[PDB]
Amino acid sequence: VQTPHEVVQSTTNELLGDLKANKEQYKSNPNAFYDSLNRILGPVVDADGISRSIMTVKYSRKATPEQMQRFQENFKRSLMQFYGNALLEYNNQGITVDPAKADDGKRASVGMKVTGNNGAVYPVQYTLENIGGEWKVRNVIVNGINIGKLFRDQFADAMQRNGNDLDKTIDGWAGEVAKAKQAADNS
């Protein structure tokens, strides 16, 4: 029943309220942090669609349920590892969820602005899909950087170097996200 705006806003509130409260616990315990992130973001994120897009359908169709699942576990845990600290260190304010424009009932867009302590406003564009009546986040753009595209390219590069070996690409995906981070930070 939640509109794209409500999904993004409510999830934002829910996440930050939890991080503010249990910051110290999550710092000393990555697993507890991981569980909360999955618990809060999981129901509103299309992990499968995100994974298929990163892998491209050509190779996603050549991935067993095991391989697909090992990849999601790796990816997520790597994201927390290389971006989670930035979340825990949030003691800022002024999160603006822009008024969401109309949708086609299948695809939706929601804008967000984050005001840092410096005062610099960073733009964030959420793309949501309607899966089985529910809106879930399919992709995100940060500072004009398409994240879905970023990791898609990184996966492609990895596959090229690994001779299109899925297992090798998935097993070393954490280091690929690490490269992705610095690749994005330099931009």
TrEMBL record:
Source species, domain of life: Bacteria
Gene: ttg2D
UniProt KW DNA-binding keyword: no
InterPro entries associated with the record: MlaC/ttg2D, Tgt2/MlaC_sf
Keywords for the protein's UniProt record, in alphabetical order: Signal
Coiled-coil segments on the chain, per record: none
Name of the protein in question: Toluene tolerance protein
Phylogenetic placement of the source organism: Bacteria, Pseudomonadati, Pseudomonadota, Gammaproteobacteria, Pseudomonadales
